Amino acid sequence: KTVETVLGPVPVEQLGKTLIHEHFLFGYPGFQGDVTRGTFREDEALRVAVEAAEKMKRHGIQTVVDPTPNDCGRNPAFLRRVAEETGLNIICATGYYYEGEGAPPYFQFRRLLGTAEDDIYDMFMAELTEGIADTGIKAGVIKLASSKGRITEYEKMFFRAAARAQKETGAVIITHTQEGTMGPEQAAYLLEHGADPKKIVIGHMCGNTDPDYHRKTLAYGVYIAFDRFGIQGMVGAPTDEERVRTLLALLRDGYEKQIMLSHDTVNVWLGRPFTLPEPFAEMMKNWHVEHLFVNIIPALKNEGIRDEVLEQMFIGNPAALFSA
Amino acid sequence: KTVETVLGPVPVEQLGKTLIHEHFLFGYPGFQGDVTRGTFREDEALRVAVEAAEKMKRHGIQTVVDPTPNDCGRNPAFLRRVAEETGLNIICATGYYYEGEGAPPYFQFRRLLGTAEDDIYDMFMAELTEGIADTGIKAGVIKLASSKGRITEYEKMFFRAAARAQKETGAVIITHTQEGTMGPEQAAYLLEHGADPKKIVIGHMCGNTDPDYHRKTLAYGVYIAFDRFGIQGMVGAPTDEERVRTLLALLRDGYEKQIMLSHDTVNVWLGRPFTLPEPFAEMMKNWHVEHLFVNIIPALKNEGIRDEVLEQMFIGNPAALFSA
Ligand SMILES: [Co+2]
Ligand SMILES: [Co+2]
Ligand SMILES: [Co+2]
Ligand SMILES: [Co+2]
Numbered sequence: 001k002t003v004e005t006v007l008g009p010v011p012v013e014q015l016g017k018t019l020i021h022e023h024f025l026f027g028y029p030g031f032q033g034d035v036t037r038g039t040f041r042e043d044e045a046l047r048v049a050v051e052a053a054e055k056m057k058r059h060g061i062q063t064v065v066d067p068t069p070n071d072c073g074r075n076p077a078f079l080r081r082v083a084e085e086t087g088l089n090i091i092c093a094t095g096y097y098y099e100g101e102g103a104p105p106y107f108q109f110r111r112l113l114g115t116a117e118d119d120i121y122d123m124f125m126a127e128l129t130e131g132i133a134d135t136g137i138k139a140g141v142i143k144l145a146s147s148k149g150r151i152t153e154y155e156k157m158f159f160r161a162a163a164r165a166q167k168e169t170g171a172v173i174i175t176h177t178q179e180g181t182m183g184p185e186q187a188a189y190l191l192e193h194g195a196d197p198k199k200i201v202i203g204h205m206c207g208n209t210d211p212d213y214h215r216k217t218l219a220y221g222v223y224i225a226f227d228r229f230g231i232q233g234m235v236g237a238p239t240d241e242e243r244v245r246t247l248l249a250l251l252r253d254g255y256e257k258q259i260m261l262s263h264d265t266v267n268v269w270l271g272r273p274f275t276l277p278e279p280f281a282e283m284m285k286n287w288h289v290e291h292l293f294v295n296i297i298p299a300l301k302n303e304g305i306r307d308e309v310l311e312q313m314f315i316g317n318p319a320a321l322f323s324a
Numbered sequence: 325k326t327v328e329t330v331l332g333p334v335p336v337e338q339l340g341k342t343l344i345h346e347h348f349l350f351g352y353p354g355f356q357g358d359v360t361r362g363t364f365r366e367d368e369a370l371r372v373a374v375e376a377a378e379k380m381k382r383h384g385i386q387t388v389v390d391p392t393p394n395d396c397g398r399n400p401a402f403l404r405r406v407a408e409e410t411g412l413n414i415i416c417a418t419g420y421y422y423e424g425e426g427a428p429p430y431f432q433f434r435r436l437l438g439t440a441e442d443d444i445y446d447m448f449m450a451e452l453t454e455g456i457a458d459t460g461i462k463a464g465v466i467k468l469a470s471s472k473g474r475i476t477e478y479e480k481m482f483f484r485a486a487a488r489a490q491k492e493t494g495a496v497i498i499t500h501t502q503e504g505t506m507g508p509e510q511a512a513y514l515l516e517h518g519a520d521p522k523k524i525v526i527g528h529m530c531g532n533t534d535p536d537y538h539r540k541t542l543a544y545g546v547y548i549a550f551d552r553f554g555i556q557g558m559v560g561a562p563t564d565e566e567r568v569r570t571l572l573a574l575l576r577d578g579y580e581k582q583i584m585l586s587h588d589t590v591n592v593w594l595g596r597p598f599t600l601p602e603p604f605a606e607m608m609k610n611w612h613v614e615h616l617f618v619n620i621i622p623a624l625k626n627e628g629i630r631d632e633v634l635e636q637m638f639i640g641n642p643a644a645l646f647s648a
Pocket of ligand 3: 500528
């Protein structure tokens with residue numbers, strides 16, 4: 001009846017309204033080597049993170065799942081400070097980014113050793129049941145990801161180690177799909193290996209606009225997430241208008257008990273500060289933590305979606321996902 | 325007339341006997357993510373490092389160039405403690421590992437901002453002239469690497485930045501080639517952007533056993549390095565007899581003034597402990613900082629290599645390399 005948060009175990013019944021996918025801190029693998037010009041200003045980072053946490057607060061959010069991979073700047077101790085200034089429940093993860101957006105050299109080396117899959121499994125088990133580093137914080141979800149048109153050999157070891165730690169701990173698995181691909185494959189692959197569909201969230205399902213692709217993924221009984229609201233202009237990548245008509249199609253079909261929404265914001269960028277160019281700039285202007293409440297839900301309500309359905313998505317599904 | 329070490333500038337005429345490529349500490353990108361089961365045992369790390377530094381001194385070594393890339397665990401402060409404890413000059417680098425076992429997502433992203441090269445260049449300048457992070461320690465060389473059979477467009481970004489930074493600072497450039505390829509290509513591309521051949525060392529040249537490939541590279545006037553003595557069986561690598569055979573053919577042609585030697589050891593692995601398989605463990609038995617001196621040099625001498633030549637490689641070349 002409890003889930004591990006950055007402030008310890010919390011009874012599921014108390015999660016309330018939650019965002020399944022947001023990042024307080026995030027850096028692309030490699031950000032670490034640019035420490036000289038992209039130094040981490042820990043108090044400025046906290047200001048902006050707490051700010052993002054209070055904004056979520058003002059729309060009723062009580063819980064955020066921050067699935068930042070281990071190789072992407074994950075900082076449990078930091079998240080713990082944010083949860084203190086705001087009271088927000090923050091669940092973190094254990095996992096690595098996908099081959100294209102991560103740091104594979106390390107586990108690619110353990111492959112030569114023939115212990116990779118088993119080392120990953122040991123890392124998941126240790127972070128889910130003992131603590132991350134010396135922080136005392138346990139991850140509450142296992143984060144997985146696969147590339148553009150396939151689940152690579154490197155990525156499959158993570159999925160197999162994940163199914164194994166889930167059988168052993170019953171932890172929730174949340175994934176990321178690259179550019180609208182592999183949703184069904186991921187669910188099939190995980191289930192084929194003993195994972196419980198009711199503890200799986202296939203993410204970035206909004207990256208694809210064919211409701212049919214979603215119905216295939218949903219047929220496995222797993223949850224899915226439209227978690228990139230606000231992100232547009234990746235040159236051919238879905239727009240919020242497309243996200244909504246796809247969402248509305250699935251809700252009108254009766255799939256509300258399997259759907260969750262988020263924005264996938266990066267509130268504090270690790271590494272050297274930048275600025276997007278005028279083109280992408282505009283398109284991404286609604287990429288912030290209030291976009292769902294201020295823009296998306298109103299558009300959903302104006303299309304006939306009832307409050308009970310919204311509450312099933314933001315409250316009942318997370319509650320259900322983190323228990324059983 | 326000085327070069328930056330981990331303890332400040334040191335007159336080039338005081339470097340004496342130098343190992344051009346050794347790693348006190350090293351981690352393949354992604355090791356950071358495995359911190360829970362692979363924390364950094366400092367005091368023990370410094371102890372192993374110091375013994376290694378002691379074993380080098382024992383053989384007359386006064387200076388070691390530790391080119392650990394930014395994304396591979398480079399730690400100037402830690403290197404500074406090894407130097408203080410041993411009196412050994414330690415020169416570090418600024419640079420990223422090759423795209424095969426480096427951490428490309430971060431700077432790959434900055435390419436989309438259209439600022440990568442200038443960013444990398446600003447990173448090189450800062451670390452070469454101002455300091456690494458808040459260490460006050462400056463890098464003494466720019467570290468570059470290319471992939472197997474190619475210098476990818478991500479890698480060329482760094483090469484262009486290095487030549488630019490070299491023209492501005494006169495800093496030495498040390499490179500790594502992957503599996504005996506691209507030596508001549510690296511030299512040509514660097515020379516094409518204004519880098520100076522007398523301040524370039526093409527590394528892992530011993531990864532190719534064709535003395536012609538070597539002559540092709542040496543014709544550019546750059547230095548080359550047989551820097552992996554002791555490593556055999558791993559990375560589809562040649563053997564030390566193959567290295568010695570190739571080395572002797574070049575020494576007999578009169579190339580002693582463009583050749584340097586090292587072992588490319590990793591005295592303290594970052595991340596989680598391991599132990600090589602039985603097949604390799606056996607082949608890598610001589611991979612330690614005393615091998616050149618205990619096994620290789622005698623063999624070379626028992627081949628007629630006189631002490632004046634060996635002194636040129638170990639003393640005269642590093643002295644010429646680092647000074648104008
Ligand atoms: Co993702
Ligand atoms: Co994300
Ligand atoms: Co190398
Ligand atoms: Co090396």
